[PDB]
Design a protein around this ligand. Structure first.
Ligand code: FE
Ligand code: FE
Ligand code: FE
Ligand code: FE
Ligand code: FE
Ligand code: FE
Ligand code: FE
Ligand code: FE
Lengths: 168, 169, 169, 168, 169
């Protein structure tokens, strides 16, 4: 490829798995979002929050797809796994699953940060610092704080309603 | 002496410096509380905002006594600012109680500053205390006392703590 | 530990807390310089404003590390803020060379933290550390260096100190 | 009380009597105001002036009530005496009674200023200087000047009419 | 007496009248300084404007005490305004040190009035006196002190006097 320069083969394949990981995480958040719009659940604040996180994750994937093209590597998209669950239980259990999801996505980010370093691609490591750090710490903290807040407000009943309203 | 020094006693100057350190101390305390309420296991952003503002407020009060020192020709002597002895503030209610006690300590020290300036017939010092550390310091004490009262009523824990923090924000 | 914690070494936590203390101390020193230049026998409002803004900036840097400590689910442990090395900062030039030293000292501590953060596989700490030490410390250490050169040229005392203080303001 | 600090018991009770004194003075001015709206009197300038002074005094009372609460003392409101008169006579006699009223309210203010001083409440004395002085001297002078002016303009007849119009 | 009079000692009345005279004299002196610096062999318009505004301010202070005298139903008794101590005020620095002296002198008389007002149980006189002596006399005596320090630093004559006069303007 005419633009390819100092782009290791294994950085190329790791970028493709991060793309799949973000598309998957976007799919989970989509599952959670419409689970909370069910008639027997009906937590619209939760639903909006997970709709947006699913748009966010789909945007992160496209960011890694654009970086792939811009390095002259070639995107390899695979199947996107079905979400592990269909019914996410309570609002609290959804958030705990989402925190796990976010940590799973960001562990995978670190694994790609070491592959970028152990191949001397200074500018893929530059980009990953602007994902895995730049805003990852703000996002992991945000779900952590939501969990702390929901456990305080009382994780069921009226405390779950009040938490929903201040999400929305 | 000084150019701009006119009816300014020595132990007024040393009490002013003691007051500067006290305000800087209280500012540090509030800074401790502000970022405690931003820990991921706490997450009381309304509490955090209130104490961050009280921290800035206390710092500006320290600077008011610093300008007045310079202005009567005294000399600012700045000392070490001790860290709060206890930085696990616990609940929102425990922090408000510690804060109320802090406010009264600062105001006790000011009140003793007011007697020393009385036994020196430095009416300017007594006036500075009156124009700056009384109209709103009786308000700062009352607003905390009133937050305590509200937090107690709403229930000091759980859902009522949440709704208190919301109405604070 | 804390549930948001992920890849955060214990020695990084302690070094962030040391850096919070350095920035607060930095801020205290600049507070001293600011009100010393507001003394009725000094009256350099340019220097005074400069150090008072540097003192605010330093306090802001300290909160940046406090926020970050909370990010990674570490524990802010605040320490006593030492009294500044002196009270009389001498000429405007002496105050500036002391400030340059103080800046290099704070930046030195960032470097030790930077190595510690690199030898612990913490990409995001070194990213944060790298920005503060490099991005704008080649702003602030350069600008104080130029002020020192400019004040030596304009003449470090007398009329030249006056004109420097005006062009600062 | 959790906020109470350096607030002597006798400053607390004196604040309550000043509250009653201001509510009383507000009641007198209300009497004077509607006396001057009587069909056989009909001095609308006088009436407006006394309506406003009755609002003013009711506001001063509330100021002392807020200060009581803010020091953590407790408000004790008593009966409010009927005004000493029903018919205030001429405009001039109303003003002379009002000057007496104002001096009676401000003497009571001084008595509370000495109690605040002889108990070392620097910040109750601070507040009373912002009532008994801040504007008391301006207000006592204003009624004094009105009396001087009405005696000049001729205190009865057309001079009373002219004075009314420049009040209004 | 007068029918608005209430709690107003006879010796307070006489001391207010003395203070009216001091402020008018103060104002006259500053009038001298202003037009001396407008002489064709002096031509310092900065100093000239400064003293001409101080002369207006002093005249305003005098009317403040006149108004107050009327408040308490005392009698304004005006006295002859003495000629200023000289006509040639010398250097800008000498004029400023004379102004500092003049300000301290007027402020001295306020203090004697303050004690007289306190030893006569006149809370409102000392309140008024306290404000003028303290509130802005730590404005005006400090600002002249800083001008004196600044003019000594910039060099009290020659080019430095020029630059000071420009930064005044
Ligand atoms: Fe993500
Ligand atoms: Fe304070
Ligand atoms: Fe306060
Ligand atoms: Fe810094
Ligand atoms: Fe800096
Ligand atoms: Fe009244
Ligand atoms: Fe004056
Ligand atoms: Fe003056």
């Amino acid at each position: 490829s005419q633009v390819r320069q100092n782009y290791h083969e294994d950085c190329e394949a790791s970028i493709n798995k991060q793309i799949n990981m973000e598309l998957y995480a976007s799919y989970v958040y989509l599952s959670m979002a419409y689970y909370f719009e069910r008639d027997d659940v009906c937590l619209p604040g939760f639903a909006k929050f997970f709709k947006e996180s699913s748009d966010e994750e789909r945007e992160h994937a496209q960011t890694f797809m654009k970086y792939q093209n811009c390095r002259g590597g070639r995107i390899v998209l695979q199947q996107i796994a079905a979400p592990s669950m269909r019914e996410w239980g309570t609002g609290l259990e959804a958030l705990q699953a989402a925190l796990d999801l976010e940590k799973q996505v960001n562990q995978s980010l670190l694994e790609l940060h070491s592959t970028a370093s152990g191949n001397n691609d200074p500018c893929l490591t530059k980009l990953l610092e602007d994902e895995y750090c730049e805003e990852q710490c703000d996002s992991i903290k945000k779900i952590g704080c939501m969990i702390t807040k929901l456990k305080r407000c009382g994780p069921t009943g009226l405390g779950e309603c009040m938490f929903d309203k201040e999400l929305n």
